[model samples]
Structure formats: C-alpha cells, structure tokens
Target: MKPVTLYDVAEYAGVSYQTVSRVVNQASHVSAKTREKVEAAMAELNYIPNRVAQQL
Candidate 1:
C-alpha cells in the first residue's frame, strides 16, 4: 500500500498541510489540541515520511 503523506494526513485530520508540517517539525508555536489532531490522524493512518521527501 502507498504510505500516507503530509497532504494525506492533513486532509484526513481536516487541517492544512502547513499545520501538519508544523507538527512534524515540532514547532513550539502550535497549540496542543492542534498537535493532538495531527498526531491522531498520523497514527490512525500509519503515515510514514519517506527519506527523500523528508530531505526536501
């Protein structure tokens, strides 16, 4: 199966990919509730970032 991506996760979580990017980078400015929503979606979908994508 194709792995879930940031866009996929963000869509699943009803958030913007920018928000998902914030959660991935662990930016301190993000709210806890927003982080939780992103995490929940990632966990539920088994989202795993590919190395090439991460390096970009």
Candidate 2:
C-alpha cells in the first residue's frame, strides 16, 4: 500500500493538503487548533514525509 501522505492526513483532518503541508513544514498562517488537528491526523494516519521528493 502507498504510505500515507499529507493528502491523506488532510482528508482525515477535513482540511486542505496545502494546509497540512504548511503544518508539516512548520510554516506560518496556521492556528494552534488547526495545527493540533493536522498533527492528530498525521499520528493516526501514520504519515511519513518524503523529503527527497519534496525538494525536487
């Protein structure tokens, strides 16, 4: 199975993947509550960020 990505986490968290990516990369413009939701979704979904792919 494909590993869980930010899209999955965003779907599970009822937010946008772009928003989740922002959270994943520790960017600004996200509230603490939303961040918590994204974090919870990531934990529950077992998401692993692909750094190599992201830089490319």
Candidate 3:
C-alpha cells in the first residue's frame, strides 16, 4: 500500500497541506475544529511520518 501523505490528509480534511503540516507539528495557531478534522483524517488514513524525511 502507498504511504499516506500530508496532502492526503489535507484533502480528506478539506484543508490546505500547510494546515495539515501545522496540525501535525502541533502548532498552537490551528483552531480546535481544524485540529480535530486533521487528527481524524490522520487516524483514518493511518498516517505515519517519515522521521528520516523530517531530518532532511
């Protein structure tokens, strides 16, 4: 199976990829509702960040 990406979550959540990024990063600027949507999308998609990619 293909890995789930932030773009996938963003599209599923009806938000921008940047918003998904913010939500995943735990940035405080995201609204509670937005966070909820993003979180739900992540859960549904089984998103797991690539730690090695983050280090790049």
How well does each candidate superpose onto the true structure, as a TM-score?
0.71, 0.69, 0.71
Q: Write one digit per residue (lDDT tens) for candidate 3, span 1-56.
A: 33555688889888877777776666756588888787777778888633123432
TM-score (C-alpha, index-matched) for candidate 3:
0.71
* Candidate 1's TM-score: 0.71
lDDT to native, each model = 0.71, 0.69, 0.69
Candidate 1 local lDDT, residue 9: 88
Question: What residue pairs are clashing in model 1?
Answer: none
Q: How big is the positional error of residue 10 in model 3, measured in Å on the Cα after superposition?
A: 0.4
RMSD of each: 3.7, 3.5, 3.6
Model 1, 18: alpha-carbon shift in Å? 1.0
Instruction: Give candidate 2 misplaced runs (Cα > 4 Å).
Output: 1-3, 48-56
Model 1, runs deviating above 4 Å: 48-52
Clash-forming residue pairs, model 3: none
Q: Write the per-residue lDDT of candidate 2 for residues 1-56, one digit (tens) a residue.
A: 34554577889999876777777666756578978887777768877643224433
Order of models, best lDDT first? 1, 3, 2
Worst 10 residues of 1 by lDDT: 47-56
